[PDB]
Design a protein around this ligand. Sequence first.
Ligand SMILES: Nc1ncnc2c1ncn2[C@@H]1O[C@@H]2COP(=O)(O)O[C@H]2[C@H]1O
Ligand SMILES: Nc1ncnc2c1ncn2[C@@H]1O[C@@H]2COP(=O)(O)O[C@H]2[C@H]1O
Ligand SMILES: Nc1ncnc2c1ncn2[C@@H]1O[C@@H]2COP(=O)(O)O[C@H]2[C@H]1O
Ligand SMILES: Nc1ncnc2c1ncn2[C@@H]1O[C@@H]2COP(=O)(O)O[C@H]2[C@H]1O
Lengths: 474, 474, 474, 473
Amino acid sequence: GTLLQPTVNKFSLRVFGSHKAVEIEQERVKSAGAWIIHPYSDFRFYWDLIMLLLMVGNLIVLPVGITFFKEENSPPWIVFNVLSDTFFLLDLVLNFRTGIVVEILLAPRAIRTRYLRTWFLVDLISSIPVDYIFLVVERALRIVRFTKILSLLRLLRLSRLIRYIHQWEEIFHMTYDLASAVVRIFNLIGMMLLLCHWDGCLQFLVPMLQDFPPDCWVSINHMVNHSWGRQYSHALFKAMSHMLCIGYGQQAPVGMPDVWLTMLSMIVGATCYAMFIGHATALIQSLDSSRRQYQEKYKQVEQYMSFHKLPADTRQRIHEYYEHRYQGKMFDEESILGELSEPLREEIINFTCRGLVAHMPLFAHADPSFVTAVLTKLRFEVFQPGDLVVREGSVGRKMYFIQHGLLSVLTRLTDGSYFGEICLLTRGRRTASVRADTYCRLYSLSVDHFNAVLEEFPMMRRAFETVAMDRLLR
Amino acid sequence: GTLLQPTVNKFSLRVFGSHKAVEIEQERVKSAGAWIIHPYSDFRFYWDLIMLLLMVGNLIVLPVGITFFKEENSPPWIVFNVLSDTFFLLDLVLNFRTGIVVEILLAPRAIRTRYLRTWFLVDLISSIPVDYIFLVVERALRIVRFTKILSLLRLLRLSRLIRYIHQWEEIFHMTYDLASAVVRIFNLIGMMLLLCHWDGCLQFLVPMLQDFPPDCWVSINHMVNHSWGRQYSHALFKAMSHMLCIGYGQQAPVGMPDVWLTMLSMIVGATCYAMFIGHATALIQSLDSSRRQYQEKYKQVEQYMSFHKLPADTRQRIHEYYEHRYQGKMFDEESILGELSEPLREEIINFTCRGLVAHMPLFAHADPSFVTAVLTKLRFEVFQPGDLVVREGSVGRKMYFIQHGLLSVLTRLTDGSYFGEICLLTRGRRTASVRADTYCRLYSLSVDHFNAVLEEFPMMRRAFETVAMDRLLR
Amino acid sequence: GTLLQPTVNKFSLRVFGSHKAVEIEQERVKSAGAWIIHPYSDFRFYWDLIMLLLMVGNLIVLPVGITFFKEENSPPWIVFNVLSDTFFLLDLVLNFRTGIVVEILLAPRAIRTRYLRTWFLVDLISSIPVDYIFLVVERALRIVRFTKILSLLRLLRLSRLIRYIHQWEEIFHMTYDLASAVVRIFNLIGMMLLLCHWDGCLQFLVPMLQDFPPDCWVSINHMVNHSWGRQYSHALFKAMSHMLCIGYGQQAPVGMPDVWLTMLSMIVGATCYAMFIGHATALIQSLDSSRRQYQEKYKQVEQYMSFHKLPADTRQRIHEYYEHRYQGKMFDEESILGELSEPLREEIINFTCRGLVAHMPLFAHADPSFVTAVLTKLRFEVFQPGDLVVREGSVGRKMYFIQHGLLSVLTRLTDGSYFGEICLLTRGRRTASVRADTYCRLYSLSVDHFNAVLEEFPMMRRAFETVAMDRLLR
Amino acid sequence: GTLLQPTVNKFSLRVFGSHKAVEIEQERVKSAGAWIIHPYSDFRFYWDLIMLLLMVGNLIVLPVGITFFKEENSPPWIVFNVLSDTFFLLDLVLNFRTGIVVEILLAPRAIRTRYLRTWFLVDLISSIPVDYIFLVVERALRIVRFTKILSLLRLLRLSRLIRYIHQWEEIFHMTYDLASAVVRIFNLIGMMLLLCHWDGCLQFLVPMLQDFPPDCWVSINHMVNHSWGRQYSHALFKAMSHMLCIGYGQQAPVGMPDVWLTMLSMIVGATCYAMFIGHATALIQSLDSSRRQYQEKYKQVEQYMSFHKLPADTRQRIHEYYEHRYQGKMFDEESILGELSEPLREEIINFTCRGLVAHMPLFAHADPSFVTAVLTKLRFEVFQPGDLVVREGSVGRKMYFIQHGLLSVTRLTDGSYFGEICLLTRGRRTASVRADTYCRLYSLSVDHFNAVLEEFPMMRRAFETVAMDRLLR
Ligand SMILES: Nc1ncnc2c1ncn2[C@@H]1O[C@@H]2COP(=O)(O)O[C@H]2[C@H]1O
Ligand SMILES: Nc1ncnc2c1ncn2[C@@H]1O[C@@H]2COP(=O)(O)O[C@H]2[C@H]1O
Ligand SMILES: Nc1ncnc2c1ncn2[C@@H]1O[C@@H]2COP(=O)(O)O[C@H]2[C@H]1O
Ligand SMILES: Nc1ncnc2c1ncn2[C@@H]1O[C@@H]2COP(=O)(O)O[C@H]2[C@H]1O
């Protein structure tokens, strides 16, 4: 009895919010009882999965059954039509109690007026069997052709199929992350295949109603008395060749109703192929945008290089810097770390600098709170070999830690080491000079952040003082 | 008598400014009297709505009347031509007094020179009936063909139609918000349909003037003596098949003037179809850009994830954070709140936090000025379960309020609660530790903003002191 | 004698810099004398304008002269060929002394090696008349066909035409601001027209060399003995119909060399039409980008509106705010004013606020230096009616000036007025409350900027004190 | 013996990191011995370069050999098939020991399960010769047609070719900077040419198996007894004309299997041509984006100009300012200098201002450390002529240096400087400076100036002496 209520699911959590909002929605459904179908409930799922398959089966089978078969009084055809009319009438009956997303669950007022204003007439016309009525109520050939065109009123179920497919596609952008362009283009492919299947049946249907004049292509190809499969094959070939703008026959089409159907199918095919090109272009432009932005940024850089007329060796030095800095990846490290929360930043920086945790003895013994408080305030820097990181007699600004590479002070030291220590404490000038031997990834620490961390932790101040005196002894 | 002046309307307000600027424009119109038509006045509306319909009627009917009908001396055709010449001459007469937007309302100088420099000759040629003049002044078949080609000079009214349609489209981007690409593409569709309707009439017109040679397609299909409708149908089929690049006849076109018309229509159709593909692509790329930017941003995030070689569980934790933070929506909350004004921000934050207003007793009794002054300085934050928001023995930085979820301090508390209070007042370390039990939306308050609000309001300082002492008792 | 040197022009100033850099380049040219042609000099202009016209004339006329005419020994044809060979040999001779932009003006070393490495062979082959040599040196039909194919070596002048057209197009992005896509697409249109004109001549040329077999289309259409114009017309129709993917004949092409030419022209036409669609799409997407960014920004805003589930009246209030703030224009007022210089900002703000200059008596008497020093520090703000700008008992933050609209303090005041005065001086709370009656554009002044301007100007401090005492009297 | 290990190369450095990480990967390979092939090693290079050429040769030659030739028992055809089966079986054998990038080098567990889960069946089917088996085991015409369709199972080597081409293309985005769209579009061109070459062979193959009915196009064109080259030419013309949406014959195709092949090739050609248009559009939009952003920015500027209804002379003054400021180049000087490191900034500013170094005597004698410390804190500014840079009786804010142009206060040209004494005296502006031409200037802020004086005390006295000299002037 709870199947009319929306259950607790991932889409339910992402739409309603917490479990309490889901319970509020369930109580709003339970305001009335067995009169309201919530539009996110599993009953609408369990119904629409049936109705989509039935609608696809009818929209494929029904024109082939109308146009190509001669004796329309076969029993399983009548059984199939009766079943289709039954389910598509029960669908409207269940629609009457259903909810409407704009979620207006007011049953006696909003539902009835929203149907009678928007989408009751089309579903009502497509639901009921019109041809059986005129058969019961009622020059026989005009009557039979009239009943055939009336039986073509079943084709308005397409408008309901489109509505349910768009409701599904609005649902499954949220339970699964899907590229939008893929959904759009497979929707368009289904529409195009369906339209070509219509035009085949139509271009056989029109010479049927005129009792095959000698001007029509069926009489010219002498294929009146073949089986329905081969006639369907030739008609579909003709329709697809008009639709993809080919050029079908030897002669121009002579009969006047052939000309206008031809022109109609040509226009429809040209517009559908144009929209298909558009969707394919929009899909292709969204494949390697991360690599494309890197390309645009380097175009911008060499534009700036050209503006100041820089030398060639400097230009390739810049190029090597970008190749060993970004590695073809155009990411904004500031905004991504800004969009996150604090524990995510802590976990990321721990995973990136557990090597610096492991090699350094000062981080081996201290509290991990202190370790994270240091690590959250570093900055990643990359140097090229031959460069002097710190020159002697500087102002003194920053400390450095060593991720990779080895560095030479004119006394060499490899990765896992550190320098820039004592000049922050003594506040003096730079004692020795540090060179870059290779590409060396470094993390840097600002002095204001350093004093803030020392204000947060007094014992590591004495630890740095002891290791600075040891460094002075070295 | 005020219909020459621009009235007070929505476009009038968005162009001129206040009502006073509209009155200044009305006085500038009333500088002269019954000699100037302001280009935004309702008289130009009331005139152009007639003239567009007349121009469309002529540009559809006139070639069909020229080419297909034999006896051109029928009375209602002459009546129709006389009416068309009358209205399109009166249009030029009313153009003489009209205003010109660049609004140059100087009648005797700017209007006359701007016509005689830019667009007087084309309207003058398209206005007057040339063929009736040569009929009055004046081997009869060459004369009749000469009059037919002279009567084709009516087709230069297209240049006026384009000018008025662009003036309308420049108007209605401002009274109604319209997607620009839709306007462009329906303008192009109208142009393409009109060009195909020209080419049908033209490809029947050329074998008319040569008295139907046996090489032409009309003689080959033996359709000289059919009605004009069927001839128009076959000619339009031929023109559309050349235009959409199909391939029309059995043979190659034999007569030399057929070949060049064929090649001309093929080139025109290829270029029009190319521009149609371009407009369709530009329309499709502007449908789901909000969802596309979210996709690009997450591609950027997983690019950054790949750059530091993060583990899988961390990567899916980041993915869950974005799914429960942005919900597929790529919006910039900083810039949108920055572009607004202060009362809009106040109304938005009141509607988002009236729940926090309702549950908290401290906000229930105080002045709503104080309530808004608190609420404008919050920050929205989202945590994942298991995370520790405040760890014991911290520095003490911020207060938190609880939108959703429940939180556990190791003493549980659900939504509508608050914490982080006493550490701002005591300026000490963190007493207890707070965990996250679920996804919990929190609003955070900075201590500097907190002290500023206390400086603005002294009594709530004592209120916070009392509730902090109560919290210490707890 | 100075025509070899680059003169002082707009492109010369935008490339070289000042007049002194132009004189340095002129001295670098005058390092040698009458041996170097600078590539920006007017002599290269005066030469290339001739050579482009000659190259276009040859690339149009020469295949029509080779393929369609029978007697190739007519005198003016020989005169035309001798003139063409003369000018295209003199072009290579003048190329030897010319300069090369990469500007390497080193004549004996860089020019000779850069020709013999890159582009000497193609120009040498296309320069000299090959067929006259084999005619002087030398089954006559094989010899004549051999001379015809040798005379087709003139077609390599296309590579020189492309080089000079790209050098021109690189020049005229700088003297005139041109949309790049227009240049690209007209270059492509010229290339496509030229290729179709080649294929017409080629598809007549191949049945010439086989003495018109009965399998070829010329013999089938029985058009061997027509004039050259009609043969050229049918050949061009055949080539264009293959190129635009149409379908030409009744039968499939029977002869084997016809099939491969057909397939070649089909592939070339398909690729050219694809690139034409691409250029048209890229041109269309760059037309109304300013209006498109406004559309995307409002999509973003209503996305944010949907995220917090805002009410409808609030949503339309936001919509009215944007309509009366930006007017469909997506401009960044911060970055544009940031990119300018100081006197440009001063001139812009003077033109926007001379009304506030004129109505205010305090700005009427003071120094215009003081006036600009005030005006450069304002901020433009827009309010909706009913809003309260200043509520009584505020903290006191800012002064306001009134561009448009009228405002009511509960004592009304219209545009050109001002308020927010005395609370900056007294540093107290807000005395009276100000409402918004209409849309009212306001300029706001911050108190820190206000005190800075008072520090710059001491007498206007006393002026504000007097008018504040007058306001207190009011 | 080290060819199974990944050597020290540029891609190796850009993937692994330092030389030590390369040695760690080499030790991880050397965990086992002569049982593991590392997927970046030169042996996989030396193997795949052979296998791509063999796969292309087979995918071109084999359908032409099957469909058009009558006697399929010629010796060099059998030799060619035996060689192809040999190398494509040895490829699977060497695949068994190979590594897999996701680098899972675990040989007995990850490799076997990853093959038997993902890509063992297709390579196994495409490897072994099926037709020779049915020939050994086994109305002869049905048997021969059955063997022909079984010999068409060689065509599944395309799936391996695609995998190796994508592995190569993933490698060479890193050793060479390549535009991605060019790689995509040449991959698509190769695929389209291959598909058209398939459809030609197929549309001749189907009337072969029906012993040429009179309804087929071969019998209608009376070309059964021509050579194989001319038959291949007509079949390829028919296939390409269906593929590029042309319209081939006089009549509609009469036989029912012709109709469905026609419709299939038409659909395939339409989709391939659509994707080709898409790739061409995406390539064209990425050519002159630097010039396009300048265009969009100036559209934005004239939008702002229109919003405040500015006069024409002001608008063209703004236009001249942008033409002499950016020169059509839409670059962000802040972010580019921000993304670099400190020595790169120092080298760039030295190369841009060595003229100011050379003309100024105060920079001629001082330490180059001081020179760079001054030069890193300048700002580039551009003025229009007639403008007054400093008006008399100002507040006093900044110093200026002169890159180009000449300025009139007592005139002075490029290489000069002003704005000096008002920073020291902290007073108002003494004289007024005009702009005579377009003049590029570098500006110096007073807070940065006092910071540099705090870093260097002797140049303080140098500025004091030259300021007293300026007062004497
Ligand atoms: N043993 C050592 N090896 C290398 N550098 C050292 C040593 N001892 C001290 N230093 C210096 O200690 C300094 C601390 O900060 P500086 O940035 O001034 O530069 C650092 C190094 O040059
Ligand atoms: N009854 C309580 N339940 C939970 N937390 C409390 C309680 N009383 C005080 N606190 C703490 O009060 C602190 C105020 O600021 P903190 O951020 O230090 O962390 C807050 C809580 O841990
Ligand atoms: N005659 C007046 N009419 C309207 N407002 C006034 C008048 N005199 C003083 N004020 C107030 O002067 C105040 C100066 O700063 P406030 O922002 O506090 O708000 C301003 C006004 O409310
Ligand atoms: N000989 C001179 N020629 C030009 N300007 C000078 C001279 N001597 C001093 N100055 C001024 O010195 C001032 C220093 O800073 P100011 O920006 O006030 O403006 C500068 C100049 O106007």
